[PDB]
Amino acid sequence: KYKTKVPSPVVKCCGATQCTSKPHPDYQCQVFSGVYPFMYGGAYCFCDT
Amino acid sequence: DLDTHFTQYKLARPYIADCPNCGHSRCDSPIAIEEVRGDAHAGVIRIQTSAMFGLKTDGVDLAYMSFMNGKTQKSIKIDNLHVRTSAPCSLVSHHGYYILAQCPPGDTVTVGFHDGPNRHTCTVAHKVEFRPVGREKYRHPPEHGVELPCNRYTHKRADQGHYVEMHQPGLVADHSLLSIHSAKVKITVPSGAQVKYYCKCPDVRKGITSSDHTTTCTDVKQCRAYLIDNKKWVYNSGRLPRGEGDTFKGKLHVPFVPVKAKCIATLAPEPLVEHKHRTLILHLHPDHPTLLTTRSLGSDANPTRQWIERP
Amino acid sequence: FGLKTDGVDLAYMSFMNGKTQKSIKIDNLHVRTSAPCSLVSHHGYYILAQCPPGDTVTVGFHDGPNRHTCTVAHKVEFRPVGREKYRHPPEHGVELPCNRYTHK
Amino acid sequence: KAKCIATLAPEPLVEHKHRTLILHLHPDHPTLLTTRSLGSDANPTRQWIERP
Amino acid sequence: KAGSFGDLQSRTSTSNDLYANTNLKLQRPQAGIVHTPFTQVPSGFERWK
Amino acid sequence: CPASEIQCGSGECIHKKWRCDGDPDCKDGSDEVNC
Amino acid sequence: AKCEPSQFQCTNGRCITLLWKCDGDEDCVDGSDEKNCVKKTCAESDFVCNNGQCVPSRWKCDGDPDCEDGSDESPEQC
Amino acid sequence: AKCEPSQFQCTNGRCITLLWKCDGDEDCVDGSDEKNCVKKTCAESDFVCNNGQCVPSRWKCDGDPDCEDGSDESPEQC
Ligand SMILES: [Ca+2]
Ligand SMILES: [Ca+2]
Ligand SMILES: [Ca+2]
Ligand SMILES: [Ca+2]
Ligand SMILES: [Ca+2]
């Protein structure tokens, strides 16, 4: 039985990041633009989109 | 000794992470469930949470647990710490981030604890199944029967070669650091920590301040404040923002590793056997779905396999 | 729920003690349908709770050493919205329109 | 009226053959699969798929 | 194949080169929530068992 | 603005602390454009 | 993000329907909606006790303290 | 009665795995498993507290009481 390991997402505020290939089995990486995440302390990012 | 099992866990702290159901609605729960391991046979499941059990800010104590209360880490005695899937689970043992519970089948896994008048719970959708050992689908470990090898999560905390990585915490966004003060946004820096601030008012200003800083912007909404405090590390939870650079700081051993164990499997009632010319007649009266298999001892096995659920 | 003879308070509850109306603080007010239900909110005669599927609906509360409960036969079913018969609200997925009892 | 989150079943493996579409469906929960032709006869198909 | 017996293959139980063939696909995080949702074909080993 | 900052054509001044860090801190972008 | 005038935004940064801005329920964990509010008046048919609680006049001096304080049954009032 | 060579017999008479003979958990109800244990030392890189605790050096006099009595932050240390 496999286990799915999911590292902490990189939340880049007021900017953009790019995924890179890595030597991991079935590695997946995707950049979701236009996020406005909230944490316990409120809005994480300043820019709306 | 007990402290030898917490040498690495003392360097980690609890954290608040997204929980799909904090009672009636989604919230950032201090008891957020990260993973549910439920592949053991006799319904043993290991639940990984964001809360720390068995540690206090002052040291190790299995009677105490530690959880985040906002930016401040709170340490309290374990009070009504419970695990529920479809009915209350018996707790076997607990360790930093990990709870070992004896749960019946269910569609959900609920973990929660009490802190005086407050109640912190986290319910996640996870099919927990009871996996009987052997050829009988018993629904609860029987009192007596045939002892068979089985897979169980051991109740021992000791390191058995399984580890998880703990990383430097990412930016902890917390707007309570900003105050209008004299109509002029002030950044309050907790002692020993650094506060990253980002203001995009007409006077765009950003940077890392170690001490109370008065910015040019007049409205809290114009600024964001993130607490940078690396004294204690956190598991690289998929629900926490990653920090900058190489955030890897160490390894935390996985308690209650899966091990081979001996489980008591049910023993179906002895069949009634009647004999006829070249024919064997069996009257089967099972208690639970019991597998019956037969084969000829000749050149053609002609195997038969069927589950007997009723007489 | 939320009312007392002395006024309004969401922490207080009022019930009849024979001919005399008694008002007490809500103490372990619970809803159970084959498993404990999370309470959403309460108002007057009405209690809003998130209950898993079950054959019965049990409601009760404590008043010091006394326990008042009421269990009625009522099939409570989980009705997943969409084309998949999920058994519990998922953490993530497709957001579909659904019918809910508002908590307000 | 409110918004509720519904599961998304795993995307099936799609194999193509001459005039034939082969789907390998591995659902988590009983999932409704429906198909229809775009021609004059829809010949619709409707089945709940619970197992691979 | 994904969801089949051989979905996860390793030359030995302690090897450092793991073959994994699952339709692991990252989904967009829900609005305002910091999390890494994903969909994946259920383990073909559990199915086989 | 003092020598510790660079004034953008938009009128905001780029502090040396963030003269180049991926995100533009002024409407002129004289920070990330000058990386 | 910043929300349309149809929604109120709490100091927490999250948005709440404007109809929920002040209705006695803290709709955002920070409680910014209910933290600022004002009380409304009552009809002339209702009496107001010392705490400001309104009660119908038919309940005044009826022998039952129908408000937090006993003003409705206070000898000074009846 | 005698246990296997790789086992420890608690005073209750029940055999326990020798690996469990001394650790944080009392594996036999009588508790005699851990009664005779001996306390471990800690690396010199960790500030040993007055009451016998041991915390990393980087936490010493950091402004937060890490020992159960605050020895690391008491004026005696800094
Ligand atoms: Ca910049
Ligand atoms: Ca409100
Ligand atoms: Ca009255
Ligand atoms: Ca022991
Ligand atoms: Ca210290």
PDB file of N, CA and C in Angstrom, chain G residues 4-62:
ATOM      1  N   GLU G   4     -17.752  43.564  -2.035  1.00  0.00           N
ATOM      2  CA  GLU G   4     -18.746  44.508  -2.517  1.00  0.00           C
ATOM      3  C   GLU G   4     -19.526  45.137  -1.363  1.00  0.00           C
ATOM      4  N   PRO G   5     -20.220  46.252  -1.621  1.00  0.00           N
ATOM      5  CA  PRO G   5     -21.006  46.892  -0.553  1.00  0.00           C
ATOM      6  C   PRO G   5     -22.152  46.035  -0.042  1.00  0.00           C
ATOM      7  N   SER G   6     -22.469  44.927  -0.711  1.00  0.00           N
ATOM      8  CA  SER G   6     -23.489  44.007  -0.228  1.00  0.00           C
ATOM      9  C   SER G   6     -23.010  43.157   0.941  1.00  0.00           C
ATOM     10  N   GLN G   7     -21.713  43.173   1.245  1.00  0.00           N
ATOM     11  CA  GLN G   7     -21.154  42.371   2.321  1.00  0.00           C
ATOM     12  C   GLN G   7     -20.317  43.243   3.246  1.00  0.00           C
ATOM     13  N   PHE G   8     -20.356  42.905   4.531  1.00  0.00           N
ATOM     14  CA  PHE G   8     -19.532  43.552   5.540  1.00  0.00           C
ATOM     15  C   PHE G   8     -18.260  42.741   5.742  1.00  0.00           C
ATOM     16  N   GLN G   9     -17.155  43.434   5.999  1.00  0.00           N
ATOM     17  CA  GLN G   9     -15.865  42.791   6.225  1.00  0.00           C
ATOM     18  C   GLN G   9     -15.432  43.007   7.669  1.00  0.00           C
ATOM     19  N   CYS G  10     -15.155  41.910   8.367  1.00  0.00           N
ATOM     20  CA  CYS G  10     -14.699  41.963   9.745  1.00  0.00           C
ATOM     21  C   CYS G  10     -13.223  42.350   9.799  1.00  0.00           C
ATOM     22  N   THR G  11     -12.790  42.805  10.977  1.00  0.00           N
ATOM     23  CA  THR G  11     -11.385  43.141  11.167  1.00  0.00           C
ATOM     24  C   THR G  11     -10.479  41.939  10.935  1.00  0.00           C
ATOM     25  N   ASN G  12     -11.029  40.726  11.001  1.00  0.00           N
ATOM     26  CA  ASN G  12     -10.282  39.516  10.685  1.00  0.00           C
ATOM     27  C   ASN G  12      -9.916  39.417   9.211  1.00  0.00           C
ATOM     28  N   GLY G  13     -10.510  40.247   8.354  1.00  0.00           N
ATOM     29  CA  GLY G  13     -10.272  40.204   6.929  1.00  0.00           C
ATOM     30  C   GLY G  13     -11.299  39.416   6.146  1.00  0.00           C
ATOM     31  N   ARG G  14     -12.161  38.664   6.820  1.00  0.00           N
ATOM     32  CA  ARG G  14     -13.173  37.857   6.158  1.00  0.00           C
ATOM     33  C   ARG G  14     -14.463  38.659   6.035  1.00  0.00           C
ATOM     34  N   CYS G  15     -15.297  38.266   5.078  1.00  0.00           N
ATOM     35  CA  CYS G  15     -16.510  39.004   4.766  1.00  0.00           C
ATOM     36  C   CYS G  15     -17.754  38.266   5.240  1.00  0.00           C
ATOM     37  N   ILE G  16     -18.736  39.055   5.663  1.00  0.00           N
ATOM     38  CA  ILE G  16     -19.999  38.569   6.200  1.00  0.00           C
ATOM     39  C   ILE G  16     -21.114  39.373   5.548  1.00  0.00           C
ATOM     40  N   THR G  17     -22.200  38.692   5.183  1.00  0.00           N
ATOM     41  CA  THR G  17     -23.339  39.370   4.574  1.00  0.00           C
ATOM     42  C   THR G  17     -23.743  40.582   5.404  1.00  0.00           C
ATOM     43  N   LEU G  18     -24.056  41.683   4.714  1.00  0.00           N
ATOM     44  CA  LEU G  18     -24.357  42.932   5.409  1.00  0.00           C
ATOM     45  C   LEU G  18     -25.556  42.789   6.337  1.00  0.00           C
ATOM     46  N   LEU G  19     -26.517  41.932   5.986  1.00  0.00           N
ATOM     47  CA  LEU G  19     -27.668  41.718   6.856  1.00  0.00           C
ATOM     48  C   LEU G  19     -27.260  41.119   8.193  1.00  0.00           C
ATOM     49  N   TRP G  20     -26.062  40.545   8.273  1.00  0.00           N
ATOM     50  CA  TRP G  20     -25.536  39.955   9.494  1.00  0.00           C
ATOM     51  C   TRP G  20     -24.628  40.913  10.257  1.00  0.00           C
ATOM     52  N   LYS G  21     -24.527  42.170   9.815  1.00  0.00           N
ATOM     53  CA  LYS G  21     -23.588  43.104  10.430  1.00  0.00           C
ATOM     54  C   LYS G  21     -23.877  43.305  11.914  1.00  0.00           C
ATOM     55  N   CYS G  22     -25.152  43.434  12.288  1.00  0.00           N
ATOM     56  CA  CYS G  22     -25.506  43.566  13.704  1.00  0.00           C
ATOM     57  C   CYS G  22     -26.863  42.895  13.924  1.00  0.00           C
ATOM     58  N   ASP G  23     -26.819  41.623  14.331  1.00  0.00           N
ATOM     59  CA  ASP G  23     -28.033  40.867  14.608  1.00  0.00           C
ATOM     60  C   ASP G  23     -27.873  39.977  15.838  1.00  0.00           C
ATOM     61  N   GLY G  24     -26.895  40.265  16.698  1.00  0.00           N
ATOM     62  CA  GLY G  24     -26.698  39.534  17.932  1.00  0.00           C
ATOM     63  C   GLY G  24     -25.879  38.267  17.814  1.00  0.00           C
ATOM     64  N   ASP G  25     -25.530  37.839  16.605  1.00  0.00           N
ATOM     65  CA  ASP G  25     -24.711  36.653  16.386  1.00  0.00           C
ATOM     66  C   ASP G  25     -23.346  37.065  15.855  1.00  0.00           C
ATOM     67  N   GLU G  26     -22.287  36.614  16.523  1.00  0.00           N
ATOM     68  CA  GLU G  26     -20.927  36.860  16.050  1.00  0.00           C
ATOM     69  C   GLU G  26     -20.662  35.902  14.897  1.00  0.00           C
ATOM     70  N   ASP G  27     -20.788  36.405  13.669  1.00  0.00           N
ATOM     71  CA  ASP G  27     -20.641  35.561  12.490  1.00  0.00           C
ATOM     72  C   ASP G  27     -19.187  35.335  12.099  1.00  0.00           C
ATOM     73  N   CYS G  28     -18.279  36.212  12.513  1.00  0.00           N
ATOM     74  CA  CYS G  28     -16.853  36.035  12.283  1.00  0.00           C
ATOM     75  C   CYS G  28     -16.156  35.825  13.620  1.00  0.00           C
ATOM     76  N   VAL G  29     -15.222  34.870  13.640  1.00  0.00           N
ATOM     77  CA  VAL G  29     -14.577  34.456  14.886  1.00  0.00           C
ATOM     78  C   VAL G  29     -14.107  35.659  15.693  1.00  0.00           C
ATOM     79  N   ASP G  30     -13.643  36.711  15.014  1.00  0.00           N
ATOM     80  CA  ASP G  30     -13.177  37.895  15.727  1.00  0.00           C
ATOM     81  C   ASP G  30     -14.311  38.667  16.392  1.00  0.00           C
ATOM     82  N   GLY G  31     -15.560  38.421  16.001  1.00  0.00           N
ATOM     83  CA  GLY G  31     -16.666  39.142  16.599  1.00  0.00           C
ATOM     84  C   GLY G  31     -16.758  40.594  16.194  1.00  0.00           C
ATOM     85  N   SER G  32     -16.115  40.977  15.089  1.00  0.00           N
ATOM     86  CA  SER G  32     -16.099  42.380  14.687  1.00  0.00           C
ATOM     87  C   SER G  32     -17.489  42.889  14.331  1.00  0.00           C
ATOM     88  N   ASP G  33     -18.376  42.009  13.862  1.00  0.00           N
ATOM     89  CA  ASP G  33     -19.719  42.448  13.496  1.00  0.00           C
ATOM     90  C   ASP G  33     -20.506  42.909  14.718  1.00  0.00           C
ATOM     91  N   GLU G  34     -20.577  42.074  15.754  1.00  0.00           N
ATOM     92  CA  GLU G  34     -21.366  42.400  16.936  1.00  0.00           C
ATOM     93  C   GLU G  34     -20.626  43.290  17.925  1.00  0.00           C
ATOM     94  N   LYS G  35     -19.310  43.450  17.779  1.00  0.00           N
ATOM     95  CA  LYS G  35     -18.565  44.304  18.695  1.00  0.00           C
ATOM     96  C   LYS G  35     -19.052  45.748  18.653  1.00  0.00           C
ATOM     97  N   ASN G  36     -19.654  46.173  17.543  1.00  0.00           N
ATOM     98  CA  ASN G  36     -20.210  47.514  17.396  1.00  0.00           C
ATOM     99  C   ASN G  36     -21.696  47.399  17.085  1.00  0.00           C
ATOM    100  N   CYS G  37     -22.533  47.889  17.997  1.00  0.00           N
ATOM    101  CA  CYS G  37     -23.981  47.789  17.859  1.00  0.00           C
ATOM    102  C   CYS G  37     -24.635  48.823  18.768  1.00  0.00           C
ATOM    103  N   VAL G  38     -25.953  48.965  18.614  1.00  0.00           N
ATOM    104  CA  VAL G  38     -26.752  49.864  19.436  1.00  0.00           C
ATOM    105  C   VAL G  38     -28.104  49.217  19.707  1.00  0.00           C
ATOM    106  N   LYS G  39     -28.686  49.553  20.856  1.00  0.00           N
ATOM    107  CA  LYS G  39     -29.984  49.020  21.245  1.00  0.00           C
ATOM    108  C   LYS G  39     -31.118  49.834  20.631  1.00  0.00           C
ATOM    109  N   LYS G  40     -32.253  49.171  20.424  1.00  0.00           N
ATOM    110  CA  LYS G  40     -33.448  49.792  19.872  1.00  0.00           C
ATOM    111  C   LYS G  40     -34.475  50.060  20.969  1.00  0.00           C
ATOM    112  N   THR G  41     -35.403  50.967  20.668  1.00  0.00           N
ATOM    113  CA  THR G  41     -36.445  51.355  21.604  1.00  0.00           C
ATOM    114  C   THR G  41     -37.592  50.344  21.601  1.00  0.00           C
ATOM    115  N   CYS G  42     -38.529  50.547  22.528  1.00  0.00           N
ATOM    116  CA  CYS G  42     -39.697  49.693  22.682  1.00  0.00           C
ATOM    117  C   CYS G  42     -40.960  50.545  22.670  1.00  0.00           C
ATOM    118  N   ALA G  43     -42.071  49.912  22.295  1.00  0.00           N
ATOM    119  CA  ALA G  43     -43.346  50.607  22.205  1.00  0.00           C
ATOM    120  C   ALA G  43     -43.789  51.121  23.574  1.00  0.00           C
ATOM    121  N   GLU G  44     -44.641  52.149  23.545  1.00  0.00           N
ATOM    122  CA  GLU G  44     -45.171  52.730  24.774  1.00  0.00           C
ATOM    123  C   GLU G  44     -45.985  51.732  25.587  1.00  0.00           C
ATOM    124  N   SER G  45     -46.459  50.652  24.965  1.00  0.00           N
ATOM    125  CA  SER G  45     -47.207  49.630  25.685  1.00  0.00           C
ATOM    126  C   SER G  45     -46.329  48.772  26.585  1.00  0.00           C
ATOM    127  N   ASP G  46     -45.009  48.926  26.524  1.00  0.00           N
ATOM    128  CA  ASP G  46     -44.083  48.091  27.273  1.00  0.00           C
ATOM    129  C   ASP G  46     -43.339  48.918  28.312  1.00  0.00           C
ATOM    130  N   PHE G  47     -43.173  48.344  29.500  1.00  0.00           N
ATOM    131  CA  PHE G  47     -42.414  48.962  30.575  1.00  0.00           C
ATOM    132  C   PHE G  47     -40.946  48.573  30.449  1.00  0.00           C
ATOM    133  N   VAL G  48     -40.070  49.426  30.974  1.00  0.00           N
ATOM    134  CA  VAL G  48     -38.628  49.206  30.925  1.00  0.00           C
ATOM    135  C   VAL G  48     -38.094  49.172  32.351  1.00  0.00           C
ATOM    136  N   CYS G  49     -37.441  48.068  32.706  1.00  0.00           N
ATOM    137  CA  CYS G  49     -36.873  47.892  34.034  1.00  0.00           C
ATOM    138  C   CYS G  49     -35.575  48.691  34.160  1.00  0.00           C
ATOM    139  N   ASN G  50     -34.930  48.576  35.325  1.00  0.00           N
ATOM    140  CA  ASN G  50     -33.718  49.353  35.577  1.00  0.00           C
ATOM    141  C   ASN G  50     -32.587  48.966  34.634  1.00  0.00           C
ATOM    142  N   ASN G  51     -32.516  47.696  34.234  1.00  0.00           N
ATOM    143  CA  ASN G  51     -31.510  47.257  33.276  1.00  0.00           C
ATOM    144  C   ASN G  51     -31.874  47.598  31.837  1.00  0.00           C
ATOM    145  N   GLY G  52     -33.023  48.232  31.609  1.00  0.00           N
ATOM    146  CA  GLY G  52     -33.472  48.560  30.273  1.00  0.00           C
ATOM    147  C   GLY G  52     -34.280  47.480  29.590  1.00  0.00           C
ATOM    148  N   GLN G  53     -34.508  46.347  30.248  1.00  0.00           N
ATOM    149  CA  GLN G  53     -35.280  45.271  29.646  1.00  0.00           C
ATOM    150  C   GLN G  53     -36.731  45.704  29.481  1.00  0.00           C
ATOM    151  N   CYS G  54     -37.302  45.436  28.309  1.00  0.00           N
ATOM    152  CA  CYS G  54     -38.690  45.783  28.033  1.00  0.00           C
ATOM    153  C   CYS G  54     -39.618  44.626  28.381  1.00  0.00           C
ATOM    154  N   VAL G  55     -40.746  44.957  29.001  1.00  0.00           N
ATOM    155  CA  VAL G  55     -41.773  43.973  29.337  1.00  0.00           C
ATOM    156  C   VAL G  55     -43.143  44.596  29.090  1.00  0.00           C
ATOM    157  N   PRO G  56     -44.132  43.836  28.616  1.00  0.00           N
ATOM    158  CA  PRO G  56     -45.466  44.413  28.416  1.00  0.00           C
ATOM    159  C   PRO G  56     -46.043  44.961  29.712  1.00  0.00           C
ATOM    160  N   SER G  57     -46.818  46.041  29.580  1.00  0.00           N
ATOM    161  CA  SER G  57     -47.414  46.676  30.751  1.00  0.00           C
ATOM    162  C   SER G  57     -48.295  45.711  31.533  1.00  0.00           C
ATOM    163  N   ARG G  58     -48.940  44.762  30.851  1.00  0.00           N
ATOM    164  CA  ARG G  58     -49.769  43.787  31.552  1.00  0.00           C
ATOM    165  C   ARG G  58     -48.957  42.921  32.506  1.00  0.00           C
ATOM    166  N   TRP G  59     -47.634  42.887  32.352  1.00  0.00           N
ATOM    167  CA  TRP G  59     -46.766  42.160  33.267  1.00  0.00           C
ATOM    168  C   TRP G  59     -46.243  43.032  34.402  1.00  0.00           C
ATOM    169  N   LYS G  60     -46.501  44.337  34.362  1.00  0.00           N
ATOM    170  CA  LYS G  60     -46.016  45.235  35.400  1.00  0.00           C
ATOM    171  C   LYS G  60     -46.808  45.052  36.690  1.00  0.00           C
ATOM    172  N   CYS G  61     -46.090  44.979  37.813  1.00  0.00           N
ATOM    173  CA  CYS G  61     -46.696  44.835  39.137  1.00  0.00           C
ATOM    174  C   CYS G  61     -47.609  43.615  39.229  1.00  0.00           C
ATOM    175  N   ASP G  62     -47.267  42.542  38.518  1.00  0.00           N
ATOM    176  CA  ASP G  62     -48.080  41.336  38.499  1.00  0.00           C
ATOM    177  C   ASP G  62     -47.601  40.284  39.492  1.00  0.00           C
TER     178      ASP G  62
END
